[PDB]
Amino acid sequence: NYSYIDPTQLPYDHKWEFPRNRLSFGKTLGAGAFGKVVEATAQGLIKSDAAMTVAVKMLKPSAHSTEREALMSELKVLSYLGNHENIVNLLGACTHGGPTLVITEYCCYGDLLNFLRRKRDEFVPYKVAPEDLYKDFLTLEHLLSFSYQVAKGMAFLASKNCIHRDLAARNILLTHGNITKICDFGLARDIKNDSNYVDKGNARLPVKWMAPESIFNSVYTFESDVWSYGIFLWELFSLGSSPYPGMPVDSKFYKMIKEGFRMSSPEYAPAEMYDIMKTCWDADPDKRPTFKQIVQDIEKQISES
Ligand SMILES: CCn1cc(CC(=O)Nc2ccc(Oc3ncnc4cc(OC)c(OC)cc34)cc2)cn1
């Protein structure tokens, strides 16, 4: 489940322990076969007696030993990572006197994929009007900033020897001040009813975001996360369109990927962003850029713009 690090060997700092009786649950934000993410109010988490809204990940009674272990492993990884501005941050946990509860920060605008889809008809490639500034129009400047923030968060993950394995716009959250945060819905996503996940063997996998070595050899590395970032760039500069449009995942798809077929630039991508996508999609993982190199490339593009 984790390539370089074994999360079962990672420690859990008991400084994160929070009393479960101080949590009041609200609506369900997302749910899978064995897990769910719920909106909650945490009392006494702030130094003053002020309450705050949090997100809580938990298992359903349908979960088995495998899922119980996986939620505990997620908690250890989050505790091990520490705080980063471009990653969804750990706030606390409930490990004693009941099922395990993982408490993370609430992101007011939800997932990036749905945000892009809602903003599709309110997109401005050029500059926003001073009077129409209240309307909240999405611009090319916002898209370049989102690409930069996601590369930054990914460079941090790699420096900690962490591989995501499911990088996509659906696993990026949007909060205040146009801040994006890398996340992983994991067990709280209904993968059975999501057409972006395909039946391949005994698994349901996100094939259209996967590097060839992950599809044909089950290998996940720093370089395979870079390929998925390239697919995420295509989603972003297409304003949330599905990748490889009009093409189903079948024998013909696997053959074309192996033979070197690649998507052409999405409608709103600057040429230098499409240049990044092409290198992320190199058949040789050694020829792909690192997330650090991607960060430096986008940094130059922003300064020039
Ligand atoms: C990259 C390292 N890493 C982090 C993890 C843990 C993790 O990412 N868990 C996670 C993911 C998504 C969650 O869902 C939401 N959280 C906050 N706010 C939301 C707001 C929402 O709508 C307004 C909403 O709608 C559907 C969902 C929201 C909650 C927890 C694993 N690996």
Q: Any idea which residues carry the catalytic annotation?
A: 166
Question: Which of 16, 84, 111, 183 for mutating ligand 1's site (highest number of atoms within 8 Å of CB)?
Answer: 183
Residue nearest (by alpha carbon) to ligand 1 atom 10: 185
Tokens of 65: 């030993």
Cβ atoms of 181 and 115 closer than 8 Å = no
d(CA 278, CA 290): 13
- From 270, 280, 266, select the one nearest 116 (Cα to Cα): 266
- From 9, 256, 299, 290, select the one nearest 149 (Cα to Cα): 299
31 annotated ligand-binding residue: yes
Other beta carbons less than 10 A from residue 199's beta carbon? 11
DSSP strand pairing (23-31 vs 35-42): antiparallel
Whole-number Å distance, alpha carbon 213 to ligand 1 midpoint, is 28
First to last CA, the chain: 41
- Looking from the CA of residue 29, the nearest atom of ligand 1 is 26
Whole-number Å distance, alpha carbon 258 to ligand 1 midpoint, is 34
Cβ atoms of 93 and 102 closer than 8 Å = yes
Cβ atoms of 93 and 75 closer than 8 Å = yes
- Helices 291-304 and 222-236 sit at what angle, rounded to 10 degrees? 30
Question: What residue has token string 């700092």?
Answer: 13
Whole-number Å distance, alpha carbon 57 to ligand 1 midpoint, is 8
- What does the radius of gyration of the chain's CA atoms come to, in whole angstroms? 20
Question: In the chain, where are the structural domains located?
Answer: 11-106, 107-298
Question: Which run of H or E residues covers position 304?
Answer: helix 291-304
Cβ atoms of 143 and 136 closer than 8 Å = no
Whole-number Å distance, alpha carbon 305 to ligand 1 midpoint, is 32
Query: Is 11-106's fold the same as 107-298's?
Result: no
Give the determination technique: X-ray
188 annotated ligand-binding residue: no
Those residues whose C-beta lies under 8 Å from the C-beta of residue 129, and which sit 6 or more positions away, are: none
Contacts 24+ apart (CB under 8 A), 296-300: 297/272, 298/144, 298/147, 298/148, 298/151, 299/148
Residue nearest (by alpha carbon) to ligand 1 atom 17: 106
Which residues have CB under 6 Å of ligand 1? 29-30, 37, 55, 57, 74, 78, 87-88, 104, 106-107, 110-111, 173, 182-185
Using the CB atoms, write b or e for 209-247: b if 16+ within 10 Å. bbbbbbbeeeebbbbbbbbbbbbbbbbbbbbbeebbeee
Those residues whose C-beta lies under 8 Å from the C-beta of residue 156, and which sit 6 or more positions away, are: 84, 86, 87
d(CA 167, CA 227): 9
Tokens of 88: 């969804």
Residue nearest (by alpha carbon) to ligand 1 atom 20: 110
d(CA 35, CA 31): 6
105 annotated ligand-binding residue: yes
- From 300, 240, 291, select the one nearest 87 (Cα to Cα): 291
Those residues whose C-beta lies under 8 Å from the C-beta of residue 179, and which sit 6 or more positions away, are: 85, 86, 149
Specify the fold of 107-298.
Transferase(Phosphotransferase); domain 1 (1.10.510)
255 annotated ligand-binding residue: no
Q: Tell me which CATH code domain 11-106 carries.
A: 3.30.200.20
**30: helix, strand or coil:** strand
The 3-state secondary structure of 147-178 reads: HHHHHHHHHHHHHCCCCCCCCCHHHEEECHHH
d(CA 76, CA 74): 6
